[PDB]
Paper text:
The outer membrane is a formidable barrier that protects Gram-negative bacteria against environmental threats. Its integrity requires the correct folding and insertion of outer membrane proteins (OMPs) by the membrane-embedded β-barrel assembly machinery ([name]). [name] is composed of a 16-stranded β-barrel, which, in [name], is preceded N-terminally by five polypeptide transport associated (POTRA) domains that extend into the periplasm. Unfolded OMPs are delivered to [name] by the periplasmic [name], but how [name] and [name] work together to ensure successful OMP delivery and folding remains unclear. The results suggest that [name] binds [name] at its soluble POTRA-1 domain, which may trigger conformational changes in both [name] and [name] that enable transfer of the unfolded OMP to the [name] lateral gate for insertion into the outer membrane.
Author numbering:
A (entry chain C): 30 to 89, 96 to 107, 109 to 210
B (entry chain P): 1059 to 1300
C (entry chain A): 100 to 175, 177 to 677, 698 to 806
D (entry chain D): 26 to 243
E (entry chain E): 25 to 109
Write the structure that this text describes.
């Protein structure tokens, strides 16, 4: 595929897991140097080709705290909601399912981001609420379940990209 | 059948939208020809200089010119030639202009033309070995030849294609054929000269490579026996090291 | 822009190292610092008409770009004098200085620029010249450079003190040295009545260090003071050497070999891991690694462990070179039918140390193939093993002209073992079948057939014969070189002799010798003379004659050059169908070729590629002849049993080690030519 | 050769054509963009894409230089696990891949260097941030590299056993078992230690290590 | 046999003069200074010290004279063991 995968030298997976060396009574093995030591470590991680190698998207007070995109300090912050309406449909054939005008409270619809990489239609839902914490009216978009090719997935990489597409749209246009 | 090898050096620099270039070179062409009553072994070794310029507008102008010393040992029975060594100098220079316009992103369309003028001393010798005088000599031959050729070149890269695929066709016609020679006989004497030619051409086969350690070669040949029983020579090889 | 004396590269690393490089901030203090520094560098070059100028160009997004203007007009050396001296002429001193004031017309050897470090080295040379000749009471009182009031001429003067001569009365040795003192005094045995020489003393400390390293002490400490008796006009040396500490190699380590395994290199290196280090052993090991020939560069490094006081580890940093290759090619053609060729020749297959050679070529004119495999280290001691199979049913049938059709094949197995530090004997057995057919009528071959008891007719051009041969062969290769390709030191001689055991159709024997030696003239080993020679002789036994096909040939690359590939030798004579002299040769039973060669680096390409290439002048001296020659038969035709008909030439040669492989290119001109020279001028052997 | 136009479009085109996989043209665009936009709003993302391109374009040394530039540029970034894993992957990829890979030749007794460096890098990663997404495959790589280094040392000890220098073998295998006590290499190297002790006339220790085999008969 | 055999040395060599310098009841640093660092050491249980002689010019009889030291876990020599063949 040559697109999103590590080199094909993946035969290292089927290596013999290490086994400890018993010390008989009457003598002791020399103390381990410990320079080449591995501790016990968790699992539940994709390995081989299933493991993902793509640069995580660095978000643009350019908020980057993962599941949140709370950027912020404009006196006309309330006017950003009609700007978001202009972004939807008009600018990019999008729509907010239930968006009040003054409240700036919206719920995103299942979209379809076909940005190559064999990434099929990705349905990302979110809640568009504009807070004013520690600054003026801030932008925030708490994403929700995404579909992509699979029925559902919750890998933080694809979730990060899914929130970051809206993040970069908002940052670029405003 | 012949083998010709040339080498040389060149110096160049850019300009305000132009890339001037010049250089010097030497060449050597050995050949062996077989006929019904004539068998010749010829060697033309010499040297010369060339120039080549191009721009960002898709136009290139090139020219070469060299002098060699053609010496040939020929065994012939008719006219009592025996085994004779005809040796003389020959200086010839040609020019050409091409326009490798960007046909697409994977090829460039190049129409080009060329014209060359060359002069060589004749073969003056006596045929007294045949019993009769039969003086054989030629005037100062000053042949010239033009040619027009179109081609398309695949500018492949990426170390996966990295080839120089090219296609097209070209026609060469003699611009001047002034090879006059004089022969003598008991009944009378005769004079001869040359005429025009309408030679065709072909393209190169593969000229392939991938990286800085692989080079692949393959040549395409044509043998148009219908016109003048012409033929060509081709080869195919590649080089790699561990 | 502006600079031309120095390539712009060293300028950009000069900027980069100082602290300013693309992408970081700007500091105008560093602007002034680097301006003055580049002026100082130009003054060191000697270009005092230099003024580096900085052009600041502001750019949006708070950027800046710096341009440099370099208006260097012209530099100057115009005067050297040695005022103060009285016993030596100035010119003989000038003959040794690196820096020269002026050089005469009929040579372009030296330039005329001024480099301060060159002056310092020249002062060192002058000091050594005076001190090693006895003048111990010598120094450099004062040296002055001077500039004319035009910034176009620089002079240099030196002021010294001659002093007086002194004699080496005697030396001694002190300090806690090794228990082997006797040989130290042996090496420091000084015979009186000889004048002083400082460089002699320096060599004394150096080789004392070498010898103590040989015993096993790797970090010694040696110094010496010349107690000078001015009243008696003599000197004595007081030397102090410490024993150091017995050092030991904890680990031996290799680094750089991507392809070759650990075992192949560890198999070398007479210096052993886990013992008392010997610098001589390490040098022998590094020379052997250089000898293997498939390492473009190897260098040794010694590093004591930061732990115990006496434990040192040695690393061998290498950079392998690509050797061996496989080739493939089809030569289709109406005049040639269908032709085909393939084959791989690799000195070190995949790095395992084995050597392999395979080829196969097919056409209507020829059908040839061969296989060859060898391991140099059958056992751990170094005995070799090799096998070779070949098939040569060429059948040059078309036109049946000036040849003789043969189908031949053979298999041989050899083994060889090393006997001393630099010699390996070789023995082996072989079997070979040959079958000759068609032939062509010409003289000097029928003698071989008649020697076997059969007398075929001479008018006919048909017929055939078969032969099987069992052979015992042996060899002896004395090799001592510095590297594996175009070396700079040593010599190598090769002996190969073959005989036939009872029960074989052929009855003969064969001997060949080769000798290539290299003699440098410069200590740095850049200009060197080269001596090649090949010798060969063989013949039949028991009243019989040696086979014609196995005979010697001469002419081509690596042989006498310029003449033709395989041209030197007596030419046959054809039977009537009276006797017609052949153009080509058939091969004499005794050949001897010699060559002397003068190597010189090419002055065009830079030092990045300099190690790769090598050009030279050469003088080919060769001659081949056949002792067996019936002079009485055709004395009317010239007699070539006498080897006096020498063939020789001279010219230039060039060798290029491309990533695609070895390349050779030679130009030569025959001088003592004869008939059938078919001379060429250039060759492109690989 | 490059359009000097506002940055939004050049970033957009850069990500779009990296999304295509046109590395030969993407590396030049990205490097020019970085050198002309040194402190853009999200230049970190630019540097990470440069890492990705360099690795996938097989220009490993310049990628290593970019890694050790980024680490000092901001030693505290919420994505340094990816950078460290990419560095270790670069080391391992640089280490072992050649015609032997087609031939399946055991690359054990080759020059380690890069293997040791890769092991150190991966170990630093895993001991740094066990909660990251690049730990499992990392741990597997640690196991594989440990096995490789142990096999290399076993091979050199085996050659010394072949020669007959029955001291250096003791030191090398002792270092093996002190460093690599939990691998197959020591498991088949112990008999070499036994043989060395038996040949060394100091069998008082020999049977001692023989008892070691008595604990792992299996 | 007949093939050339390179010289092999695989130990720490010390002459009889340093052997005479050995005496029970003194620290470890002094004995390391006197005989050199130990190229061998037992890493199991007792921290005893070994010194060995390997010397064979090639196709010739090997020469071995081992010399062993025992140390308690206090930094003082307990006993020695010389052996000349």
């Amino acid at each position: 595929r040559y697109k999103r995968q590590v080199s094909g030298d993946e035969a290292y997976l089927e290596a013999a897991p290490l086994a400890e060396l018993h010390a008989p009574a009457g003598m002791i093995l020399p103390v381990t140097s410990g320079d080449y030591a591995i501790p016990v470590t968790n699992g539940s991680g994709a390995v081989g080709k299933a493991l993902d190698i793509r640069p995580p998207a660095q978000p643009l007070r350019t908020q980057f705290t993962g599941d949140t995109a709370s950027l912020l300090e404009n006196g006309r912050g309330n006017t950003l909601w009609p700007q978001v309406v202009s972004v939807l449909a008009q600018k990019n054939y999008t729509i907010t399912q239930r968006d009040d005008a003054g409240q700036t409270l919206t719920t995103d619809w299942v979209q379809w981001n076909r940005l190559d990489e064999d990434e099929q239609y990705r349905g990302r839902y979110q809640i568009s609420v504009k807070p004013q914490g520690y600054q003026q009216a801030v932008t925030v978009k708490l994403l929700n379940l995404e579909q992509a090719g699979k029925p559902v997935a919750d890998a933080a990489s694809m979730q990060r990209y899914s929130t970051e597409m809206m993040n970069v749209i908002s940052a670029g246009l405003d | 059948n012949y083998t010709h090898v040339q080498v040389g050096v060149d110096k160049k620099h850019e300009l305000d939208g132009l890339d001037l270039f010049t250089g010097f070179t030497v060449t050597h062409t050995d050949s062996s020809a077989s006929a019904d009553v004539f068998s010749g072994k010829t060697k033309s070794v010499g040297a010369g200089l060339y120039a080549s310029a191009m721009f960002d507008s898709g136009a290139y102008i090139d020219l070469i010119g060299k002098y060699v010393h053609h010496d040939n040992e020929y065994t012939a029975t008719f006219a009592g030639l025996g085994t004779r060594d005809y040796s003389t100098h020959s200086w010839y220079a040609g020019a050409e202009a091409g326009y490798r316009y960007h046909v697409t992103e994977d090829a460039w369309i190049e129409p080009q033309a060329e014209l060359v003028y060359g002069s060589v001393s004749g073969k003056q010798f006596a045929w007294k070995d045949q019993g009769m005088h039969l003086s054989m000599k030629d005037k100062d031959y000053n042949p010239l030849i033009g040619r027009t050729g179109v081609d398309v070149g695949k500018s492949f890269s990426g170390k996966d294609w990295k080839v120089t695929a090219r296609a097209g066709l070209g026609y060469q016609f003699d611009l001047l054929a002034n090879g006059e020679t004089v022969l003598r006989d008991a009944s009378g004497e005769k004079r001869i000269k040359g005429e025009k030619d309408s030679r065709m051409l072909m393209s190169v086969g593969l000229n392939a490579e991938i990286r800085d350690n692989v080079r692949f070669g393959l040549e395409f040949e044509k043998s148009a026996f219908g016109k003048y029983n012409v033929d060509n020579a081709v080869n195919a090889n590649f080089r790699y090291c561990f | 822009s502006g600079n031309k004396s120095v390539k712009d590269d060293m300028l950009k690393q000069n900027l980069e190292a100082s602290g300013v490089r693309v992408g970081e901030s700007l500091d105008r203090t560093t602007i002034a610092d680097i301006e003055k520094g580049l002026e100082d560098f130009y003054y060191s070059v000697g270009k005092y008409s230099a003024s580096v100028k900085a052009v600041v160009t502001p750019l949006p997004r708070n950027r800046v770009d710096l341009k440099l203007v370099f208006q260097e007009g012209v530099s100057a050396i115009q005067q050297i004098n040695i005022v103060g001296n009285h016993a030596f002429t100035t010119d003989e001193l000038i003959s040794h200085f690196q820096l020269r004031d002026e050089v005469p017309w009929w040579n372009v050897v030296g330039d005329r620029k001024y480099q301060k470090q060159k002056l310092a080295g020249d002062l060192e040379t002058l000091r050594s010249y005076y001190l090693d000749r006895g003048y111990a009471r010598f120094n450099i009182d004062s040296t002055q450079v001077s500039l004319t009031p035009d910034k176009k001429g620089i002079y240099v003067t030196v002021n010294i003190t001659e002093g007086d001569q002194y004699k080496l009365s005697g030396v001694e040795v002190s300090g806690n040295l090794a228990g082997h003192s006797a040989e130290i005094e042996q090496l420091t045995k000084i015979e009186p009545g000889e004048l002083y020489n400082g460089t002699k003393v320096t060599k004394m400390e150096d080789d004392i260090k070498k010898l103590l390293g040989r015993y096993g002490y790797a970090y010694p400490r040696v110094q010496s003071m010349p107690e000078i008796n001015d009243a008696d006009k003599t000197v004595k040396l007081r030397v102090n050497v410490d024993a150091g500490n017995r050092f030991y190699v904890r680990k031996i380590r290799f680094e750089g070999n991507d392809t070759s395994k650990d075992a192949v290199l560890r198999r070398e290196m007479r210096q052993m891991e886990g013992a008392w280090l010997g610098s001589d052993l390490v040098d022998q090991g590094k020379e052997r690694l250089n000898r293997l020939g498939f390492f473009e560069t190897v260098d040794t490094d010694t590093q004591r462990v930061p732990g115990s006081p006496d434990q040192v580890d040695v690393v061998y940093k290498v950079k392998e070179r690509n050797t061996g290759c496989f080739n493939f090619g089809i030569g289709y053609g109406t005049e040639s039918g269908v032709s085909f060729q393939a084959g791989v020749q690799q000195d070190n297959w995949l790095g395992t140390g084995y050597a392999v050679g395979i080829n196969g070529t097919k056409n209507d004119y020829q059908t040839y193939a061969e296989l060859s495999v060898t391991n140099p280290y059958f056992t751990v001691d170094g005995v070799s093993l090799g096998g070779r199979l070949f098939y040569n049913d060429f059948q040059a049938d078309d036109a049946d002209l000036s040849d003789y059709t043969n189908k031949s094949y053979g298999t041989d197995v050899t083994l060889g073992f090393p006997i001393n530090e630099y010699n390996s004997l070789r023995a082996g057995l072989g079997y070979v079948h040959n079958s000759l057919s068609n032939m062509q009528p010409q003289v000097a071959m029928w003698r071989y057939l008649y020697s076997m008891g059969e007398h075929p007719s001479t008018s006919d051009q048909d017929n055939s014969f078969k032969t099987d041969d069992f052979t015992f062969n042996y060899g002896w290769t004395y090799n001592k070189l510095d590297r594996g390709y175009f070396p700079t030191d040593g010599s190598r001689v090769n002996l190969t002799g073959k005989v036939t055991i009872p029960g074989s159709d052929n009855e003969y024997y064969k001997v060949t010798l080769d000798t290539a030696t290299y003699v440098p003239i410069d200590d740095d080993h850049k200009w060197v003379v080269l001596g090649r020679t090949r010798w060969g002789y063989g013949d039949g036994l028991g009243g019989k004659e040696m086979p014609f096909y196995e005979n010697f040939y001469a002419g081509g690359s690596s042989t006498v050059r310029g003449f033709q590939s395989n041209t030197i030798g007596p030419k046959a004579v054809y039977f009537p169908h009276d006797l017609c002299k052949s153009d080509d040769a058939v091969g004499g039973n005794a050949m001897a070729v010699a060559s002397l060669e003068f190597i010189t680096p090419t002055p065009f390409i830079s030092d990045k590629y300099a190690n790769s290439v090598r050009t030279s002048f050469f003088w080919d001296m060769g001659t081949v002849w056949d002792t067996n020659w019936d002079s009485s038969q055709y004395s009317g035709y010239p007699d070539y049993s006498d080897p006096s008909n020498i063939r020789m030439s001279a010219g230039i040669a060039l060798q290029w080690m491309s990533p695609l492989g070895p390349l050779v290119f030679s130009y030569a001109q025959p001088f003592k030519k004869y008939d059938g020279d078919k001379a060429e001028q250039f060759q492109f052997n690989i | 050769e490059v359009p000097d136009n506002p940055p939004n479009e050049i970033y957009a085109t850069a990500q779009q054509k990296l999304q295509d996989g046109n590395w030969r043209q993407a590396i030049t665009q990205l490097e020019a963009l970085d050198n002309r936009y040194p402190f853009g709003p999200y230049s970190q993302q630019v540097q990470l894409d440069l890492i990705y391109a360099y690795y996938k374009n097989a220009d490993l040394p310049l990628a290593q230089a970019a890694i050790d530039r980024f680490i000092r540029l901001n030693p505290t970034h919420p994505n340094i696990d990816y950078v460290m894993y990419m560095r270790g992957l670069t080391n391992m990829a640089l280490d072992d891949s050649a015609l032997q890979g087609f031939f399946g030749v055991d690359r054990s007794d080759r020059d380690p260097q890069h293997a040791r460096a890769a092991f150190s890098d991966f170990s630093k990663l895993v001991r740094g941030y066990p909660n990251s997404q690049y730990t499992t495959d990392a741990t597997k790589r640690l196991v594989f590299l440990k096995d490789r280094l142990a096999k290399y040392e076993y091979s050199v000890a085996e050659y010394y056993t072949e020669r007959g220098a029955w001291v250096a073998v003791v030191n090398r295998v002792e270092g093996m078992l002190r460093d690599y006590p939990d691998t197959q290499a020591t498991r088949d190297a112990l008999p070499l230690m036994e043989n060395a002790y038996r040949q060394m006339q100091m069998n008082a220790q020999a049977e001692k290590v023989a008892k070691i085999i008595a604990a792992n008969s299996s | 046999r007949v093939v050339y055999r390179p010289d092999i040395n695989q130990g720490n060599y010390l002459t009889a003069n340093d052997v005479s310098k050995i005496r029970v009841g003194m620290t470890q640093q002094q004995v390391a200074y006197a005989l050199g660092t130990p190229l061998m050491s037992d890493p199991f249980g007792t921290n005893t010290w070994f010194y060995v002689f390997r010397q064979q010019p090639g196709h010739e009889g090997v020469t071995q004279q081992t010399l062993t030291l025992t140390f308690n876990s206090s930094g003082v020599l307990t006993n020695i063991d010389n052996k000349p063949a």
